[PDB]
Write a protein that binds this ligand. Structure first.
Ligand code: MG
Lengths: 94, 82, 137
RNA sequence: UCUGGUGACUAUAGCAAGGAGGUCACACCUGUUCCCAUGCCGAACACAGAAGUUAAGCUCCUUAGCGUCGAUGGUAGUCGAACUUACGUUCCGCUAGAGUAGAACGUUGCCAGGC
RNA sequence: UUGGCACCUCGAUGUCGGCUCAUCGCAUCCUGGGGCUGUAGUCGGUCCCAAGGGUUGGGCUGUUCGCCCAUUAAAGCGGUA
RNA sequence: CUGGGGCGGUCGCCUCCUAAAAGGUAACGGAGGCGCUCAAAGGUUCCCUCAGAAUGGUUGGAAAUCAUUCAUAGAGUGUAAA
RNA sequence: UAUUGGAGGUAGAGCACUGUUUGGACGAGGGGCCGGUUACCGAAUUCAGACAAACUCCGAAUGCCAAUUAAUUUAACUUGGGAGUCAGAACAUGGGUGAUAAGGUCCGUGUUCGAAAGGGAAACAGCCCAGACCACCAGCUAAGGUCCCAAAAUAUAUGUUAAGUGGAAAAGGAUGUGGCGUUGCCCAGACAACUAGGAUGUUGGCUUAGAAGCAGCCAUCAUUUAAAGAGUGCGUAAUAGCUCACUAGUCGAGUGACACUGCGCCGAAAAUGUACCGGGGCUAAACAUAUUACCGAAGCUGUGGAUUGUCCUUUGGA
């Protein structure tokens, strides 16, 4: 429950997003009490490992910059054909 | 050319050139139709009248401005400063 | 899962067959499911063939849910007629499908039996398919 | 900000619930003789009166059950382009609907008595 | 094949059967090679390789076709205005 | 007019969709109406709000009328449709 | 064109309305009966699903109308004289019709041909590139290309195919081959045939034509045992049962499965002569991803020359 992420930047076009999804990572955003609207990206495999480790709900340590955010998955996106995760939403409880 | 096969729907009317007739910002003279309609897609507002055919025409000279009435209804206005 | 009991307008413009599944992309009722990967029509008669195959192969075992209903009517002109003179009469009922549209769902039966049943259904069906389980995680 | 008119805003303004309060304003109330009054009631409407009482309407305060509003990120779609004949692919702008976080039990103008 | 389209031909591209002459494809009728079989061999059925050659004479209809009478190892299916 | 003529159908007006979110837009394309009616179903002034649903009942073919809280108009608007 | 302001309901979504629909709750009406009960069946009411040219609580992109207005361009309107046109075509894209048929037919929106020569597409009005005033034995490029026919790379780097794929199809079929994961097993030694044992009370029970791994209910008990099943299993007249449940040991490294992909294979038969690369031919002269050259037009430059127009007068040059 100690997943890390990387900070997204502005104006990520269609090509950038689809390349990013075609590598082993997936974009996401965080929000909620205790933080602001930060857009990040996580590596898919470790997300899946964490989720099967904790399940649907889990107070997860999330790696952004230097600060770890107690966060749980509000909700998520999936591609049924070509099985691959598409966008994860995260809310912080703290 | 086939034969006896015939259809019971080959009929229509002549379309009426309804819809807008002026745009926000242009100078209309009084009497200018702004929006030919049926029923009230747009109600008259300030210095605007309702014809018998639900037509909307300016009462006086001025610029034309489309606006909101409440939640789901629109009106029309005309203002004279020019 | 054959025909709509009544429709308002019986002669209708044919359906668009270009794009992606508007919905029904998930297993909701059953446990395992069968989705499509191309996009053809389904004619209210090939799904009938398919549900029979599955049901009779499970020997009246677990439950089945058909997820595609043939809503659209289609017309065919009478034989040896020229072009023109109206639109023809209804020949069958269809339901367009899209890549990703789940078609059939099953539950209350082992995994291998379900996979075999959906396989046998796939061959009575004009679209490439895929075996899927209730999405979780 | 009280209190009552009046009107300006996309219900962030509403419904339901709980709880106050009648500061002389507000409704309730006594009656039909008085103009009037109702295809059919002093019901209402109108009217003369103010002895009863806040219980309800009203007012104020709480609460998001309920209503509405509602991003960011994205996805669908598509303008232009380049491939292409594929139920297509790529690039570049624009960018929904749905959903999720959330806003929200109003803001406000003039007037008259208030304090 | 029955059609659909109306693109060349109406200052004319003779249209159906038969006769003479053929020529080419093979999804092969016989003949040659095989796998088989619910093939003991003769029998048949099925599929594969095979187009070199061969693939009748009559009765009835203008008939193509089809039926019938005798045979043959077989009496093949089509293209060629 | 006509997916060659012929036969059948059609011909003027209104509404809807096809029609690609201004307007316009064709086929022997998909659906329907018109050749009227109203001395009130016109003008104006003042009043009033509906269908259905249950908690239902003298009738109760069920629901006639009557009652009561919700009814976003789900009703009505002379007629086709918008 | 940039920036504001606005009308409208298409694509997409959605089910709030009209409908069309798949499962699941939940009480109940005529009615199974004696008003009945219970099944249900016609709905009421919910929860999860979906479908729509003539459904819409919503709603783009773009088009359109106009502006206090900018910036770049050069048309625009009015009146009069003269006409020709009312058979269109194909491609691309949004739709109807037909059969998600046609080199079909009817609309919308481009382009081109018509009325357009030139280069590419073998040849080939409509495709791609590009508009020919007239020379020139000058130069640069676009689409297409660079082994020979035939001007230019037998270029460079890194990978892919083995079918002449390239250089016509499809559902399906496959230990063809390359990549990226995921994975359950393995020196305690999984996986092979590892030639090592293979049967017991016992078909016990229904024992069925008698049938003791076969016409069918299996009740399928512990192990003689490193490894074992009222027999993994080939059988059907009972049956004759070795081998991949299973590993010490022949001995010693690996070996099931899964995804998601890149390129091939099969499916694949037609009529004069190869005849589905234009020919030769090609294992790169195919494909993918980069990079650098060069060829290539009547395009665009260079020089000379007409002929008109608008400017400077440079009455000459632009
Ligand atoms: Mg001649």
């Amino acid at each position: 429950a100690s997943l890390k992420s990387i900070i997204r930047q502005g104006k990520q076009t269609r090509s950038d997003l689809k390349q990013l999804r075609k590598s082993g990572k997936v974009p996401a955003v965080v929000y909620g009490y205790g933080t602001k609207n930060v857009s990040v990206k996580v590596d898919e495999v470790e997300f899946i490992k964490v989720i099967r480790e904790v399940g649907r709900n889990g107070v997860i340590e999330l790696g952004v910059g230097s600060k770890t955010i107690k966060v749980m998955v509000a909700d998520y996106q999936f591609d049924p054909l070509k099985n691959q995760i598409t966008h994860i939403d995260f809310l912080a409880i703290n | 050319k086939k034969g006896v096969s015939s259809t019971k729907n080959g009929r229509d009317s002549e379309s009426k050139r309804l819809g807008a007739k002026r745009a926000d910002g242009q100078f209309v003279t009084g009497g200018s139709i702004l929006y030919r309609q049926r029923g009230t897609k747009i109600y008259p507002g300030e210095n605007v009248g309702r014809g018998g055919d639900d037509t909307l025409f300016a009462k006086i000279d001025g610029v034309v401005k489309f606006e909101r009435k409440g939640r789901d209804k629109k009106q029309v206005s005309v203002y004279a400063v020019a | 899962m054959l025909l709509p009991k009544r429709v308002k307008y019986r002669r209708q413009h044919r359906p668009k067959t270009t794009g992606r599944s508007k919905g029904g992309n998930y297993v909701t009722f059953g446990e395992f499911g069968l989705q499509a990967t191309t996009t053809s029509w389904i004619t209210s008669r090939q799904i009938e063939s398919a549900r029979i195959a599955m049901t009779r192969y499970m020997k009246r075992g677990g439950k089945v849910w058909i997820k595609i209903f043939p809503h659209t009517p289609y017309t065919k002109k009478p034989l040896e007629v020229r072009m023109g003179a109206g639109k023809g009469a209804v020949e069958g009922w269809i339901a367009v499908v899209k890549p990703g549209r789940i078609l059939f769902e099953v539950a209350g039966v082992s995994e291998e039996v379900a996979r075999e049943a959906l396989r046998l259904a796939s061959h009575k069906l004009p679209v490439k398919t895929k075996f899927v389980k209730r999405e979780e995680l």
